[PDB]
CSV table of C-alpha atoms in Angstrom, one decimal:
chain,number,residue,atom,x,y,z
A,1,UNK,CA,-8.9,-0.8,34.4
A,2,UNK,CA,-6.1,-2.3,32.4
A,3,UNK,CA,-3.4,-0.4,29.9
A,4,UNK,CA,-4.2,0.0,26.8
A,5,UNK,CA,-2.3,-1.0,23.6
A,6,UNK,CA,-0.7,1.1,21.1
A,7,UNK,CA,1.3,-1.0,18.0
A,8,UNK,CA,4.1,0.5,16.1
A,9,UNK,CA,7.0,2.3,16.6
A,10,UNK,CA,7.4,5.9,18.4
A,11,UNK,CA,9.1,7.1,15.4
A,12,UNK,CA,6.1,7.2,13.3
A,13,UNK,CA,4.3,10.2,13.4
A,14,UNK,CA,0.7,8.6,13.1
A,15,UNK,CA,1.8,6.5,16.2
A,16,UNK,CA,3.1,9.7,18.0
A,17,UNK,CA,0.0,10.9,17.0
A,18,UNK,CA,-1.9,8.4,19.3
A,19,UNK,CA,1.1,8.6,22.2
A,20,UNK,CA,0.5,12.3,22.8
A,21,UNK,CA,-2.8,11.9,22.9
A,22,UNK,CA,-3.0,9.2,25.4
A,23,UNK,CA,0.1,11.1,27.7
A,24,UNK,CA,-2.3,14.0,27.7
A,25,UNK,CA,-5.1,12.3,28.1
A,26,UNK,CA,-4.1,10.5,31.5
A,27,UNK,CA,-4.4,6.9,29.9
A,28,UNK,CA,-1.9,4.1,30.8
A,29,UNK,CA,-0.5,2.4,27.7
A,30,UNK,CA,1.9,-0.1,26.2
A,31,UNK,CA,3.6,0.2,23.7
A,32,UNK,CA,3.7,-3.4,20.5
A,33,UNK,CA,6.7,-3.2,18.4
A,34,UNK,CA,4.9,-4.1,15.0
A,35,UNK,CA,8.9,-5.4,13.2
A,36,UNK,CA,8.3,-5.3,9.3
A,37,UNK,CA,11.6,-7.2,9.4
A,38,UNK,CA,9.7,-10.3,11.3
A,39,UNK,CA,6.9,-9.9,8.9
A,40,UNK,CA,4.5,-8.7,12.1
A,41,UNK,CA,2.5,-6.5,10.0
A,42,UNK,CA,1.9,-9.8,7.8
A,43,UNK,CA,0.6,-11.7,10.8
A,44,UNK,CA,-3.3,-12.9,10.4
A,45,UNK,CA,-3.8,-11.1,13.8
A,46,UNK,CA,-2.1,-8.1,13.5
A,47,UNK,CA,-4.6,-8.1,10.0
A,48,UNK,CA,-7.9,-8.4,11.8
A,49,UNK,CA,-7.1,-5.6,13.6
A,50,UNK,CA,-5.0,-3.3,11.3
A,51,UNK,CA,-5.9,-4.4,7.5
A,52,UNK,CA,-3.3,-2.4,5.6
A,53,UNK,CA,-0.4,-3.7,7.8
A,54,UNK,CA,0.7,-0.3,8.7
A,55,UNK,CA,0.8,1.7,12.1
A,56,UNK,CA,-0.5,2.5,14.7
A,57,UNK,CA,-3.4,-0.3,15.8
A,58,UNK,CA,-4.8,0.0,19.0
A,59,UNK,CA,-6.7,-2.6,21.3
A,60,UNK,CA,-8.5,-2.1,24.5
A,61,UNK,CA,-11.0,-4.1,26.4
A,62,UNK,CA,-13.8,-3.4,24.6
A,63,UNK,CA,-12.2,-2.6,21.1
A,64,UNK,CA,-9.8,-2.9,18.3
A,65,UNK,CA,-8.9,0.4,16.1
A,66,UNK,CA,-7.1,1.5,13.5
A,67,UNK,CA,-6.1,5.1,11.8
A,68,UNK,CA,-4.8,7.4,14.6
A,69,UNK,CA,-7.4,10.0,14.1
A,70,UNK,CA,-10.2,7.6,14.8
A,71,UNK,CA,-8.5,5.7,17.6
A,72,UNK,CA,-7.4,9.4,19.2
A,73,UNK,CA,-11.4,10.7,18.8
A,74,UNK,CA,-12.2,7.1,20.8
A,75,UNK,CA,-9.9,7.7,23.5
A,76,UNK,CA,-11.0,11.0,23.9
A,77,UNK,CA,-14.3,10.0,24.4
A,78,UNK,CA,-14.0,7.1,26.4
A,79,UNK,CA,-11.6,8.9,29.0
A,80,UNK,CA,-13.3,12.0,28.5
A,81,UNK,CA,-13.6,12.6,32.5
A,82,UNK,CA,-9.5,12.1,32.9
A,83,UNK,CA,-6.5,14.8,32.0
A,84,UNK,CA,-7.7,17.3,29.7
A,85,UNK,CA,-11.0,17.8,29.8
A,86,UNK,CA,-11.0,20.0,26.6
A,87,UNK,CA,-9.1,18.2,24.7
A,88,UNK,CA,-11.8,17.0,22.1
A,89,UNK,CA,-14.2,19.4,23.6
A,90,UNK,CA,-17.1,19.3,25.9
A,91,UNK,CA,-20.0,19.6,23.9
A,92,UNK,CA,-21.2,18.8,20.2
A,93,UNK,CA,-20.3,22.5,19.3
A,94,UNK,CA,-17.0,22.3,20.6
A,95,UNK,CA,-16.4,19.2,19.0
A,96,UNK,CA,-16.9,20.3,15.8
A,97,UNK,CA,-15.1,23.1,15.7
A,98,UNK,CA,-12.0,21.3,17.1
A,99,UNK,CA,-12.4,18.8,14.7
A,100,UNK,CA,-13.1,20.6,11.6
A,101,UNK,CA,-9.2,21.7,12.0
A,102,UNK,CA,-8.1,18.3,12.8
A,103,UNK,CA,-9.4,17.8,8.9
A,104,UNK,CA,-7.3,20.8,7.5
A,105,UNK,CA,-4.7,19.1,8.6
A,106,UNK,CA,-4.9,15.8,7.9
A,107,UNK,CA,-5.9,17.3,4.2
A,108,UNK,CA,-3.5,20.2,3.7
A,109,UNK,CA,-0.6,20.4,6.3
A,110,UNK,CA,-0.1,17.0,7.0
A,111,UNK,CA,0.5,16.4,3.1
A,112,UNK,CA,2.7,18.8,2.7
A,113,UNK,CA,4.7,18.9,5.4
A,114,UNK,CA,5.1,15.2,5.4
A,115,UNK,CA,6.6,15.2,1.5
A,116,UNK,CA,9.0,17.6,2.7
A,117,UNK,CA,10.6,16.0,5.7
A,118,UNK,CA,10.9,12.9,3.5
A,119,UNK,CA,13.0,14.6,0.8
A,120,UNK,CA,14.9,17.1,3.2
A,121,UNK,CA,15.6,14.6,6.3
A,122,UNK,CA,15.5,10.6,5.0
A,123,UNK,CA,17.0,10.6,1.4
A,124,UNK,CA,20.1,11.5,2.9
A,125,UNK,CA,20.3,9.5,5.4
A,126,UNK,CA,20.1,6.7,2.5
A,127,UNK,CA,23.0,8.8,0.7
A,128,UNK,CA,20.1,9.3,-2.2
A,129,UNK,CA,19.9,12.5,-4.1
A,130,UNK,CA,16.7,14.4,-3.4
A,131,UNK,CA,14.1,15.6,-5.7
A,132,UNK,CA,13.7,19.0,-5.6
A,133,UNK,CA,10.7,19.0,-7.4
A,134,UNK,CA,9.0,17.8,-4.7
A,135,UNK,CA,10.7,20.1,-2.5
A,136,UNK,CA,9.4,23.3,-3.9
A,137,UNK,CA,5.4,22.3,-5.0
A,138,UNK,CA,5.0,21.1,-1.4
A,139,UNK,CA,6.9,24.8,0.4
A,140,UNK,CA,4.7,26.3,-1.5
A,141,UNK,CA,1.2,24.5,-0.3
A,142,UNK,CA,2.9,24.8,3.3
A,143,UNK,CA,3.4,28.0,2.8
A,144,UNK,CA,-0.6,29.0,2.0
A,145,UNK,CA,-1.7,27.2,5.0
A,146,UNK,CA,0.9,28.4,7.6
A,147,UNK,CA,-0.5,32.1,6.1
A,148,UNK,CA,-3.6,31.2,6.9
A,149,UNK,CA,-2.5,29.7,10.3
A,150,UNK,CA,-0.8,33.1,10.9
A,151,UNK,CA,-3.7,34.9,10.0
A,152,UNK,CA,-5.9,32.7,12.7
A,153,UNK,CA,-3.6,32.6,15.4
A,154,UNK,CA,-3.4,36.6,15.7
A,155,UNK,CA,-7.2,36.5,16.5
A,156,UNK,CA,-7.5,33.3,18.6
A,157,UNK,CA,-4.2,31.6,20.9
A,158,UNK,CA,-4.9,27.9,19.3
A,159,UNK,CA,-6.2,27.1,16.2
A,160,UNK,CA,-10.1,25.9,17.7
A,161,UNK,CA,-10.1,28.5,20.0
A,162,UNK,CA,-8.3,29.8,23.7
A,163,UNK,CA,-6.9,26.0,25.1
A,164,UNK,CA,-4.9,23.5,23.7
A,165,UNK,CA,-6.8,20.7,21.8
A,166,UNK,CA,-6.3,18.0,19.4
A,167,UNK,CA,-6.5,20.6,16.5
A,168,UNK,CA,-3.3,21.7,17.5
A,169,UNK,CA,-1.8,18.1,19.0
A,170,UNK,CA,-2.3,16.9,15.7
A,171,UNK,CA,0.2,19.1,14.3
A,172,UNK,CA,3.0,17.8,16.8
A,173,UNK,CA,4.7,15.0,14.5
A,174,UNK,CA,5.0,16.5,10.9
A,175,UNK,CA,5.5,19.7,12.6
A,176,UNK,CA,8.4,18.3,15.0
A,177,UNK,CA,10.0,16.9,12.3
A,178,UNK,CA,10.0,19.8,9.8
A,179,UNK,CA,11.9,22.1,12.5
A,180,UNK,CA,14.0,19.6,14.1
A,181,UNK,CA,15.1,17.1,11.1
A,182,UNK,CA,15.3,19.9,8.4
A,183,UNK,CA,16.2,22.8,7.7
A,184,UNK,CA,13.1,24.4,7.4
A,185,UNK,CA,11.7,26.0,10.7
A,186,UNK,CA,11.9,29.5,9.3
A,187,UNK,CA,8.5,28.1,7.6
A,188,UNK,CA,7.2,28.5,11.5
A,189,UNK,CA,9.5,31.0,13.1
A,190,UNK,CA,9.5,33.5,10.0
A,191,UNK,CA,5.7,33.8,11.0
A,192,UNK,CA,5.1,35.5,14.7
A,193,UNK,CA,1.9,33.8,15.8
A,194,UNK,CA,2.9,30.4,13.8
A,195,UNK,CA,6.1,30.6,15.8
A,196,UNK,CA,4.6,31.1,19.3
A,197,UNK,CA,1.7,28.5,18.8
A,198,UNK,CA,4.1,26.2,17.9
A,199,UNK,CA,6.9,26.6,20.7
A,200,UNK,CA,3.8,26.5,23.2
A,201,UNK,CA,2.8,23.6,22.0
A,202,UNK,CA,5.9,21.7,21.3
A,203,UNK,CA,6.8,22.7,24.8
A,204,UNK,CA,4.0,20.4,26.2
A,205,UNK,CA,5.3,17.6,28.8
A,206,UNK,CA,3.1,15.2,27.0
A,207,UNK,CA,5.4,16.0,23.8
A,208,UNK,CA,8.3,16.6,25.4
A,209,UNK,CA,7.9,12.7,26.6
A,210,UNK,CA,6.9,11.3,23.2
A,211,UNK,CA,10.0,12.5,22.1
A,212,UNK,CA,12.6,10.7,24.8
A,213,UNK,CA,10.7,7.5,24.2
A,214,UNK,CA,12.1,7.4,21.0
A,215,UNK,CA,15.6,6.9,22.1
A,216,UNK,CA,14.8,4.5,24.8
A,217,UNK,CA,13.1,2.9,22.0
B,1,UNK,CA,-32.9,25.4,7.3
B,2,UNK,CA,-29.2,24.7,6.9
B,3,UNK,CA,-27.2,26.1,4.7
B,4,UNK,CA,-24.3,24.6,2.3
B,5,UNK,CA,-22.3,26.6,0.2
B,6,UNK,CA,-20.6,25.2,-3.1
B,7,UNK,CA,-21.6,23.3,-6.5
B,8,UNK,CA,-22.9,20.1,-6.4
B,9,UNK,CA,-20.2,19.0,-8.7
B,10,UNK,CA,-17.8,19.2,-5.9
B,11,UNK,CA,-17.0,15.6,-4.5
B,12,UNK,CA,-16.9,17.6,-0.7
B,13,UNK,CA,-19.6,19.3,-1.2
B,14,UNK,CA,-22.0,16.3,-2.3
B,15,UNK,CA,-20.3,14.2,0.5
B,16,UNK,CA,-22.3,16.9,2.4
B,17,UNK,CA,-25.5,16.7,0.3
B,18,UNK,CA,-26.0,13.2,0.5
B,19,UNK,CA,-25.1,12.8,4.2
B,20,UNK,CA,-28.1,16.0,4.6
B,21,UNK,CA,-30.4,13.5,2.8
B,22,UNK,CA,-29.9,10.5,4.6
B,23,UNK,CA,-30.3,12.1,8.0
B,24,UNK,CA,-33.2,13.8,7.0
B,25,UNK,CA,-32.0,17.6,7.1
B,26,UNK,CA,-33.6,20.0,5.1
B,27,UNK,CA,-31.1,22.6,3.6
B,28,UNK,CA,-30.5,25.4,1.2
B,29,UNK,CA,-27.9,25.4,-1.5
B,30,UNK,CA,-25.8,28.3,-1.2
B,31,UNK,CA,-24.0,28.5,-4.8
B,32,UNK,CA,-20.0,29.9,-4.7
B,33,UNK,CA,-19.4,30.5,-8.0
B,34,UNK,CA,-15.6,29.6,-8.2
B,35,UNK,CA,-15.2,30.6,-11.6
B,36,UNK,CA,-16.1,34.4,-10.3
B,37,UNK,CA,-13.6,33.9,-7.5
B,38,UNK,CA,-16.7,34.1,-4.9
B,39,UNK,CA,-14.7,31.6,-3.1
B,40,UNK,CA,-12.2,34.3,-2.3
B,41,UNK,CA,-14.5,37.0,-0.7
B,42,UNK,CA,-13.9,38.5,2.2
B,43,UNK,CA,-17.4,37.0,3.7
B,44,UNK,CA,-16.7,33.9,2.3
B,45,UNK,CA,-13.2,33.4,4.0
B,46,UNK,CA,-15.0,34.0,7.2
B,47,UNK,CA,-16.3,30.7,7.3
B,48,UNK,CA,-14.3,29.0,5.1
B,49,UNK,CA,-10.6,30.1,5.5
B,50,UNK,CA,-8.9,28.0,3.3
B,51,UNK,CA,-11.7,29.5,0.9
B,52,UNK,CA,-13.0,26.0,-0.7
B,53,UNK,CA,-16.2,24.3,-0.3
B,54,UNK,CA,-18.3,23.1,1.0
B,55,UNK,CA,-19.2,25.7,4.1
B,56,UNK,CA,-21.9,25.1,6.5
B,57,UNK,CA,-24.0,26.9,8.2
B,58,UNK,CA,-26.9,26.5,10.8
B,59,UNK,CA,-28.6,28.4,13.9
B,60,UNK,CA,-25.7,27.3,16.0
B,61,UNK,CA,-22.6,27.3,13.9
B,62,UNK,CA,-20.1,27.5,11.0
B,63,UNK,CA,-18.1,24.7,10.3
B,64,UNK,CA,-15.7,23.8,7.1
B,65,UNK,CA,-14.1,20.8,6.0
B,66,UNK,CA,-16.9,18.0,4.3
B,67,UNK,CA,-16.6,15.0,7.0
B,68,UNK,CA,-16.4,17.6,9.8
B,69,UNK,CA,-19.6,19.1,8.3
B,70,UNK,CA,-21.0,15.3,8.7
B,71,UNK,CA,-19.7,14.3,11.6
B,72,UNK,CA,-21.6,17.5,13.0
B,73,UNK,CA,-24.6,16.8,11.2
B,74,UNK,CA,-25.1,13.4,12.1
B,75,UNK,CA,-24.5,13.7,16.0
B,76,UNK,CA,-26.8,16.7,16.5
B,77,UNK,CA,-29.4,15.1,14.0
B,78,UNK,CA,-28.8,11.7,15.3
B,79,UNK,CA,-32.5,10.3,16.0
B,80,UNK,CA,-33.5,11.4,12.7
B,81,UNK,CA,-33.7,9.7,9.3
B,82,UNK,CA,-30.7,6.8,9.3
B,83,UNK,CA,-30.2,6.3,12.8
B,84,UNK,CA,-27.3,4.3,12.2
B,85,UNK,CA,-25.3,6.1,9.6
B,86,UNK,CA,-22.6,6.9,12.4
B,87,UNK,CA,-23.0,4.1,15.1
B,88,UNK,CA,-25.8,4.7,17.8
B,89,UNK,CA,-23.3,4.1,20.5
B,90,UNK,CA,-19.3,5.2,21.2
B,91,UNK,CA,-18.1,1.7,19.3
B,92,UNK,CA,-20.2,1.5,16.8
B,93,UNK,CA,-19.0,5.3,15.7
B,94,UNK,CA,-15.3,4.6,16.8
B,95,UNK,CA,-15.7,1.4,13.9
B,96,UNK,CA,-17.2,3.5,11.5
B,97,UNK,CA,-14.6,6.4,12.5
B,98,UNK,CA,-11.8,4.1,11.3
B,99,UNK,CA,-13.2,3.4,7.6
B,100,UNK,CA,-13.7,6.9,7.0
B,101,UNK,CA,-10.4,7.6,8.3
B,102,UNK,CA,-9.2,5.0,5.7
B,103,UNK,CA,-11.2,6.8,2.9
B,104,UNK,CA,-9.5,10.1,4.1
B,105,UNK,CA,-5.9,8.7,4.1
B,106,UNK,CA,-5.8,5.9,1.6
B,107,UNK,CA,-8.4,5.8,-1.0
B,108,UNK,CA,-9.4,9.6,-0.5
B,109,UNK,CA,-5.9,11.1,-2.2
B,110,UNK,CA,-5.4,8.3,-5.3
B,111,UNK,CA,-9.1,8.4,-6.5
B,112,UNK,CA,-9.0,12.1,-6.2
B,113,UNK,CA,-6.0,12.7,-8.7
B,114,UNK,CA,-7.7,10.5,-11.2
B,115,UNK,CA,-10.9,11.8,-10.4
B,116,UNK,CA,-8.9,15.2,-11.4
B,117,UNK,CA,-6.9,13.8,-14.2
B,118,UNK,CA,-9.4,12.2,-16.0
B,119,UNK,CA,-12.9,13.9,-15.2
B,120,UNK,CA,-12.1,17.1,-14.6
B,121,UNK,CA,-8.6,18.0,-16.0
B,122,UNK,CA,-10.2,17.6,-19.9
B,123,UNK,CA,-12.7,20.3,-19.6
B,124,UNK,CA,-10.0,23.5,-19.6
B,125,UNK,CA,-7.9,21.4,-20.9
B,126,UNK,CA,-5.0,20.7,-18.6
B,127,UNK,CA,-2.1,18.6,-20.0
B,128,UNK,CA,-2.8,14.9,-17.7
B,129,UNK,CA,0.5,13.9,-16.0
B,130,UNK,CA,0.7,9.9,-17.0
B,131,UNK,CA,2.4,10.0,-14.9
B,132,UNK,CA,0.4,11.1,-11.8
B,133,UNK,CA,-2.6,8.8,-13.6
B,134,UNK,CA,-0.2,5.4,-13.4
B,135,UNK,CA,0.9,6.3,-10.2
B,136,UNK,CA,-2.5,7.0,-8.4
B,137,UNK,CA,-4.1,3.9,-10.3
B,138,UNK,CA,-1.7,1.8,-9.1
B,139,UNK,CA,-2.0,2.9,-5.4
B,140,UNK,CA,-6.0,2.6,-5.6
B,141,UNK,CA,-5.6,-0.6,-6.7
B,142,UNK,CA,-3.9,-1.3,-4.0
B,143,UNK,CA,-6.8,-0.1,-1.4
B,144,UNK,CA,-9.2,-2.0,-3.2
B,145,UNK,CA,-7.7,-5.0,-2.8
B,146,UNK,CA,-7.5,-4.8,0.7
B,147,UNK,CA,-11.3,-3.6,0.4
B,148,UNK,CA,-12.2,-6.9,-1.6
B,149,UNK,CA,-10.8,-8.9,1.1
B,150,UNK,CA,-12.9,-6.9,3.8
B,151,UNK,CA,-16.4,-7.0,1.7
B,152,UNK,CA,-16.1,-10.7,1.6
B,153,UNK,CA,-16.1,-10.8,5.1
B,154,UNK,CA,-18.9,-8.0,5.5
B,155,UNK,CA,-21.4,-6.7,3.7
B,156,UNK,CA,-20.4,-2.6,4.2
B,157,UNK,CA,-17.1,-1.6,5.5
B,158,UNK,CA,-17.6,-0.8,8.7
B,159,UNK,CA,-20.4,-3.9,8.8
B,160,UNK,CA,-23.1,-5.0,7.8
B,161,UNK,CA,-24.9,-2.5,7.8
B,162,UNK,CA,-24.7,1.2,5.5
B,163,UNK,CA,-23.4,3.6,7.1
B,164,UNK,CA,-21.0,7.0,6.4
B,165,UNK,CA,-17.6,5.1,6.4
B,166,UNK,CA,-19.5,3.8,2.7
B,167,UNK,CA,-21.2,7.0,2.5
B,168,UNK,CA,-18.1,9.3,2.4
B,169,UNK,CA,-16.8,7.1,-1.2
B,170,UNK,CA,-19.3,8.0,-3.4
B,171,UNK,CA,-18.4,11.1,-4.5
B,172,UNK,CA,-15.0,9.8,-5.9
B,173,UNK,CA,-16.5,6.6,-6.5
B,174,UNK,CA,-19.1,8.2,-9.0
B,175,UNK,CA,-16.8,10.0,-11.0
B,176,UNK,CA,-14.3,6.8,-11.7
B,177,UNK,CA,-17.4,4.8,-12.4
B,178,UNK,CA,-19.8,7.3,-14.7
B,179,UNK,CA,-16.7,10.1,-16.0
B,180,UNK,CA,-13.5,8.0,-16.5
B,181,UNK,CA,-12.4,4.6,-18.4
B,182,UNK,CA,-11.3,3.7,-15.3
B,183,UNK,CA,-14.5,1.8,-13.9
B,184,UNK,CA,-13.2,-1.5,-13.9
B,185,UNK,CA,-10.7,-1.0,-10.4
B,186,UNK,CA,-14.3,-1.4,-9.1
B,187,UNK,CA,-15.9,-4.1,-11.2
B,188,UNK,CA,-12.8,-5.8,-12.1
B,189,UNK,CA,-13.1,-6.2,-7.9
B,190,UNK,CA,-16.3,-9.7,-7.3
B,191,UNK,CA,-16.8,-8.0,-3.5
B,192,UNK,CA,-16.0,-4.5,-4.4
B,193,UNK,CA,-18.4,-4.5,-7.1
B,194,UNK,CA,-21.2,-5.5,-5.2
B,195,UNK,CA,-20.5,-3.0,-3.0
B,196,UNK,CA,-20.2,-0.2,-5.3
B,197,UNK,CA,-24.0,-1.4,-6.4
B,198,UNK,CA,-25.2,-1.0,-3.1
B,199,UNK,CA,-24.6,2.3,-2.4
B,200,UNK,CA,-24.4,4.2,-5.3
B,201,UNK,CA,-28.0,2.7,-5.6
B,202,UNK,CA,-29.2,4.7,-2.6
B,203,UNK,CA,-32.0,6.8,-3.2
B,204,UNK,CA,-29.8,9.9,-1.6
B,205,UNK,CA,-27.0,9.6,-3.8
B,206,UNK,CA,-29.2,9.5,-6.8
B,207,UNK,CA,-31.0,12.5,-5.5
B,208,UNK,CA,-27.6,14.3,-5.2
B,209,UNK,CA,-26.5,13.1,-9.1
B,210,UNK,CA,-30.0,14.3,-10.2
B,211,UNK,CA,-29.5,17.9,-8.1
B,212,UNK,CA,-26.1,18.6,-10.3
B,213,UNK,CA,-28.4,18.8,-13.1
B,214,UNK,CA,-31.4,20.8,-12.2
B,215,UNK,CA,-28.5,23.7,-11.2
């Protein structure tokens, strides 16, 4: 067996999703930078595996893939017998029950939380003005999603059931930025069940590893 | 039979229906009249906690989110209908899945904003953001520029066979071409135009278009 290849910077939320999945699945990997300032995202050989010139990309001995969620589904299937065996289920019913929340994250939680972090953390870093109109509508949307999560997480320990799965994992990247790079952490802590869930999943050793990697590179 | 909740005119509902037709799975449509707030009934929220459509029920499970429903159907009924719709092995499945994600992350948001602003907003006449329109038309054009390159090297997005990757584009694509003045986004592009001709010509999709009529 050979370490898989992950293309992109660990600071990327989509890259981070792949990295924490590989750690949870106990899969060795190498991270290969894709530096836009060196035109690396536009190289023909990169575009063959990532047609959008975005990150992450993935390669192993069998295939090249793009989009973080499809990379992670592939990884979870290929290495099903390894690491966290239930991460994306152990049968088609479990997989689907997990997947619906993965889709919910990509369609609702992700876009609203993403925009919030953008304005609140990164505009000030660049010393440019925020769009309060952007702040507001996405806080409402995210509020509604989190009210739904609060109810679900009072009836179930994790989103898809009684154990940590990809459903929860997939919330880590945007959730981390929201809680640790903005002052909107209270959206989680003010909600008793969501707060517990966030503390539980963000304290996993896999996720903690990803956090460190952002400092070294 | 399996139950699909919601109106055929919905893009997310349509995604599930055309998949069921491609997979030769019989189904029953259970209406959800959102104009009557039926999507917020306590019993419906039990199977669709976001109060959205579609929802899906069969003998073993209840699911929400159209793409998750469709992945479930394609696996459960892998030996029915179009057997290659989501691949016949793990490599084929992933190669299709990456373009399904491209649709949901890149094509979907912008084409979806345009479908709303131009095809849905005039009914219940809402002032259109010109604005949200301008931005998303440019975003969609960029995505279709990528598709134009890809579809010059491949008959369909994931390979030379029609798959769920292509299918997932039908709902938003059809409203743009047939219910807005933005059809040129697909026809101004040579390879995307051919691709659109092929996927929109499938009998499964044409059935969905008809099911909207006989509501």
